Amino acid sequence: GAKRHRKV
Amino acid sequence: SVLTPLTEKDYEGLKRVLRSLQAHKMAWPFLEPVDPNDAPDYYGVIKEPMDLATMEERVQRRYYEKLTEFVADMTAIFDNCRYYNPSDSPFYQCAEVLESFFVQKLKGFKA
């Protein structure tokens, strides 16, 4: 997986 | 007491704890500071970053007065990762596993 900020 | 400072010998036990974490197979996301090439907005979101390399430097420099301060840096490595990453991500998983390992090793150091 690539790191990305959660939105929920 | 929790107000009692760390001694020189205590610092060798913290190093052992820090090194046990750095050797754990789930520690991979936390060995170094987050690279912006991997997470371009990370430092826009997490304003108090921490990583295992930073903790190692601070243990080498005797930055910590009290064990509570060391535990606060450690717990931030994990709380930042759950704040940033979604709950189904590999990162979040690493943070759950490594935090329980750290609690098991921290109980060992305290007694």
Side-chain angles (χ1 to χ4, degrees), chain B residues 6 10-19 67 70 109:
Chain B
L6 300 152
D10 285 347
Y11 260 90
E12 299 308 2
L14 285 179
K15 182 51 134 69
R16 176 160 196 85
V17 170
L18 173 66
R19 293 276 189 239
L67 167 67
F70 175 89
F109 179 91

Side-chain angles (χ1 to χ4, degrees), chain A residues 1-6, chain B residues 29 32-46 49 80-81 84-86 91:
Chain A
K3 171 178 276 179
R4 175 173 31 69
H5 181 37
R6 58 196 291 186
Chain B
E32 298 296 323
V34 168
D35 179 12
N37 282 319
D38 293 340
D41 65 3
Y42 182 80
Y43 292 91
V45 177
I46 300 301
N80 287 340
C81 175
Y84 186 72
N85 302 277
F91 310 102

Side-chain angles (χ1 to χ4, degrees), chain B residues 82-96:
Chain B
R82 296 183 286 223
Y83 189 91
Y84 186 72
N85 302 277
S87 57
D88 59 345
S89 67
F91 310 102
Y92 194 103
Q93 191 196 47
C94 291
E96 301 272 72

Side-chain angles (χ1 to χ4, degrees), chain B residues 1-15 58-68 70 109:
Chain B
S1 181
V2 285
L3 279 191
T4 300
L6 300 152
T7 62
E8 266 300 302
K9 255 164 77 103
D10 285 347
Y11 260 90
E12 299 308 2
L14 285 179
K15 182 51 134 69
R58 290 178 170 191
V59 170
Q60 177 181 60
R61 294 210 193 278
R62 303 307 191 246
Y63 165 90
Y64 304 105
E65 297 203 341
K66 307 160 181 300
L67 167 67
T68 49
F70 175 89
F109 179 91

Side-chain angles (χ1 to χ4, degrees), chain B residues 36-56:
Chain B
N37 282 319
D38 293 340
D41 65 3
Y42 182 80
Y43 292 91
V45 177
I46 300 301
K47 307 299 193 169
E48 291 162 76
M50 183 55 49
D51 58 283
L52 297 170
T54 302
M55 291 191 74
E56 174 176 355

